[PDB]
Amino acid sequence: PMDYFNIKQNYYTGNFVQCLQEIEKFSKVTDNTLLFYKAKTLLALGQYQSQDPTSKLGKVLDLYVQFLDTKNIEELENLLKDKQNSPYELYLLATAQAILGDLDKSLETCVEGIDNDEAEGTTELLLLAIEVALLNNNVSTASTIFDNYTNAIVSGDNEMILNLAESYIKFATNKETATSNFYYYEELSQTFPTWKTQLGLLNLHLQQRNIAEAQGIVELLLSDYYSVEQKENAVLYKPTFLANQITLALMQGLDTEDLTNQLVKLDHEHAFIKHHQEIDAKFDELVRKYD
């Protein structure tokens, strides 16, 4: 096998430039996996462009990039409505559903396409099912989905996808935070040093209360190799960077007003800001109720 190993390995670690390179090695050749990953990698580089307007998957991908701007799902849904849709197509539709806040429907879209583990894109969709279940705080379902799928079995390149899914579960469950999970994140940060692997390691240090190491990685990301030389996907990961800095400061007793303001200007729909506005309103409502 191994045709896609390097493509997928660089995509899932956030090495999107090298991912595009690995895809270009198949110059003037296309299949649905190549389409899927080239489209997602071009999107992540801020340089999306319609790869295959002809085919089903390409139409879906363009609808999906459009949705990212318009936040309207009607075209995507009406295109996939009642049709026999592949796991890649379902990946995009369920990501859209999840972005709208409709996490139940999103998980159902995912579960639709997880029947056969030898079908193209199924492992991808399983990872998405896991993520979408964890977003909805349905951790038992996420574990069950993962355990049943994986025990029921693994190609060399899907191995990393299943590890990624498992690592999200272990993050949500504080499972072996200080042993196997931390080793996974740190190894990836060392072998594939990017914004993504670096923020993963940072989250694992924060879960361990390792203030010094967390601050070391914050300083490293603030340096020039990441904030200047990697100004490309620095932008992509900046809102989560800001959220992480906020939790580190709070762990130290420091002020977070400036950081919260930056993040709310840059990405007012970040998960941190949803939680923040919700607890703000919850507390102001208590203040009112007991006066």
Binding site: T95, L206, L236, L250, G253
Partner: protein
Amino acid sequence: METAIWIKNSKLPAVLVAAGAFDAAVQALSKQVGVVKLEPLKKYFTNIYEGCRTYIPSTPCELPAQLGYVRAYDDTVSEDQILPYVPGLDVVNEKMNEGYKNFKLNKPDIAIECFREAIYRITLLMVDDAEDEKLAHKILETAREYILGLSIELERRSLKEGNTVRMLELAAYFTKAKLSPIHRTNALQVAMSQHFKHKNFLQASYFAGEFLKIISSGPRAEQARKIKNKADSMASDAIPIDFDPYAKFDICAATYKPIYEDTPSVSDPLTGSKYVITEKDKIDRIAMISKIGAPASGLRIRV
């Protein structure tokens, strides 16, 4: 499922707050420390809830980031100790030290802000330890004594010249706050020289003597000694004030008057400050969140 694990393992207000059970936490604070005004605690509720949460990027990045939790302990503890991470006494001590720093720099409003913050942090502590619990109570009482003394002095400063008796009384009552000795020195210096200025030589000699048994050398000690020598030579008070240094009394944290053992008083259940009886049902001046004289079951910070 994490939040419900937390709540099953501890009903401490800190843990309720971390779980998002703001309402249950407010009700618990009401019964335990008489909390009644909520606004000054908002930030602290917020700080706790966001301090035990962190966000990892999803795949793809357009997907909302995924939430993970910072726990109190590593995985080597039993399942009934799965608890949120809540910042502890070391941050409280930092806030107290900033208070002391602003005290020495004669920035009393900012010092008060620091001591109030340490009080609010203690109100929402989680300790697992009898010694940390006692230490938390002692720091809480210390911060109250510093706020009380600073508020007496700010009142004194606010006064119109012509309120000389009230001013000298406040200068004296400032010396009653249970600061560290080196800090009590500031209050003793104020009281000594204000009473000396206004021809209260007996008072001045007492305050100078109390100063000299903490600081014995340096230029302030010598100023104190010459003030005491002159005052002992005069041996008179032009202006009598309500103050007996050897009696047992507290200072009303609202009206700044002595409360003797026979004086009917009520207390703040949270900070333990004391008030004359006409302040019952009003809000405590020390931390401004709890009700003076209210029934309360006692601060809970021990898991």
